[PDB]
């Protein structure tokens, strides 16, 4: 019930029940039809929250494993919990990335959409890269990288540097460099080029794009400072 | 593995995985032995959050369903408020089932008995929040019955200053104002708890309580 499922998701969005919210949009996606800009948001929001909950628990629990170096019984316990959250994390990611391969990207009849979903794909392969270890990690990093890259060229091609989507993928791509394969110079020139070029053209912001673009632009300069 | 469980409870806590944290402390509790002060609180923290997320979602949908008196939409909001409600009761029930089989029975200390009576009054109050129809009547009764019993023990056993004594006062008066709708009463139970502990003058745990007591009183007043 495309209509009743999307309603149920907006409901579960307000109730802050995001597993419910994501279960509604999965179904809407698995129906095969291209998501409206509104459905694409809901799914994006549902899984960002669904996955974000595990990233948070992982980071906390991992920083604890690092903190209990030299405390065996404790580190052991931290680690087994980390590993337990990671599996949840991956499954979430594997679900999302699959919807993305089987439904979202395939049916993206638009440039913006192609760019949005491939960014998202680079995102979730990043979340997997964050918790992947040695062996499997190399190909995960590359799967994110390669998704970000195609998304980058299409954004450079199709969009003004002030486009909320273009900026959010530049921000995210620079983060991937900085934190994923830790290429600090690259992350910096990417993030700094994206900042400069849209900063040079504020006057291209619509009434629909000012807060989104200027938000991410504020997220870019912040990362530039941190780095 | 009991300290094992308690540890993972502190872990799932720092991680904000209260489904985890709660499944640990339920197993702990289910082993049979009286709970320490640390275990009892982890239990309360775990489920307060498990229940809390439902109560929170419940409220959101509730007004959505009410601010919608639009049919098929209110119907969808109705059935949703309901699924959450069901989830909310199963939670309250699991706790109230723990409170009957293990917790209150083992309660050797007065503070113990009162901490578990308060809690038992808390969780019948969460049920009452969503108890509609013929249902609500007995539900509030059970809540009030445990708060009151808890209240009298504490009155004649603990000090006005005791964090556990204060916290029951705090919640019993929240029952009055919100469940019974007795603001005047809720305010006398609260004011008296403050005044009597203010005379007698566990800081950390019992100063936040007067904080919540006084915070509530200024609102209502």
């Amino acid at each position: 019930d495309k209509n009743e499922l999307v309603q149920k998701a907006k409901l579960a969005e307000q109730a802050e029940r995001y597993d419910d919210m994501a279960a509604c949009m999965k179904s809407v996606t698995e129906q095969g039809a291209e998501l409206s800009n509104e459905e694409r948001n809901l799914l994006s929001v549902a899984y960002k929250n669904v996955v974000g909950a595990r990233r948070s628990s992982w980071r906390v629990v991992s920083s604890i494993e690092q903190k209990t170096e030299g405390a065996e019984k404790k580190q052991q316990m931290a680690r087994e919990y980390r590993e337990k959250i990671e599996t949840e994390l991956r499954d979430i990611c594997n679900d999302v990335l699959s919807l993305l391969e089987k439904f979202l990207i395939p049916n993206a009849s638009q440039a913006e959409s192609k760019v949005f979903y491939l960014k998202m794909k680079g995102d979730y392969y990043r979340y997997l890269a964050e918790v992947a270890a040695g062996d499997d990690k190399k190909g995960i990093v590359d799967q994110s990288q390669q998704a970000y890259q195609e998304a980058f060229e299409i954004s450079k091609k199709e969009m003004q540097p002030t486009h909320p989507i273009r900026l959010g993928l530049a921000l995210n791509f620079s983060v991937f460099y900085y934190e994923i394969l830790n290429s600090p110079e690259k992350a910096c020139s990417l993030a700094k080029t994206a900042f400069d070029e849209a900063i040079a053209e504020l006057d291209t912001l619509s009434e629909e794009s000012y807060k989104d673009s200027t938000l991410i632009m504020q997220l870019l300069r912040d990362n530039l400072t941190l780095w | 593995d009991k300290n094992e469980l308690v540890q993972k409870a502190k872990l799932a806590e720092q991680a904000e995985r209260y489904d985890d944290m709660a499944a640990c402390m339920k197993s702990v509790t289910e082993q049979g032995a009286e709970l320490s002060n640390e275990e009892r609180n982890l239990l309360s923290v775990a489920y307060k959050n498990v229940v809390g997320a439902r109560r929170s979602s419940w409220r959101v949908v509730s007004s959505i369903e009410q601010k919608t008196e639009a049919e098929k939409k209110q119907q969808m909001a109705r059935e949703y408020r309901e699924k959450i409600e069901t989830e909310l009761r199963d939670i309250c029930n699991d706790v109230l089932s723990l409170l009957e089989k293990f917790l209150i029975p083992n309660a050797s200390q007065a503070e113990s008995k009162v901490f578990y009576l308060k809690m038992k009054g808390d969780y019948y109050r969460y049920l009452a929040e969503v108890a509609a129809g013929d249902d609500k009547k007995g539900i509030v009764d059970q809540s009030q019955q445990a708060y009151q019993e808890a209240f009298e023990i504490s009155k004649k056993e603990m000090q006005p200053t005791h964090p556990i004594r204060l916290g029951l006062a705090l919640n019993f008066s929240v029952f009055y104002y919100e469940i019974l709708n007795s603001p005047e009463k809720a305010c006398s139970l609260a004011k008296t708890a403050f005044d009597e502990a203010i005379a007698e003058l566990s800081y950390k745990d019992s100063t936040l309580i007067m904080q919540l007591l006084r915070d509530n009183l200024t609102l209502w007043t």
Partner: peptide
């Protein structure tokens, strides 16, 4: 309603 007892990424909506 009564009281009782470091690198940033895109906004995502």
């Amino acid at each position: 309603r009564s009281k009782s007892a470091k690198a940033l990424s895109f906004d995502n909506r």
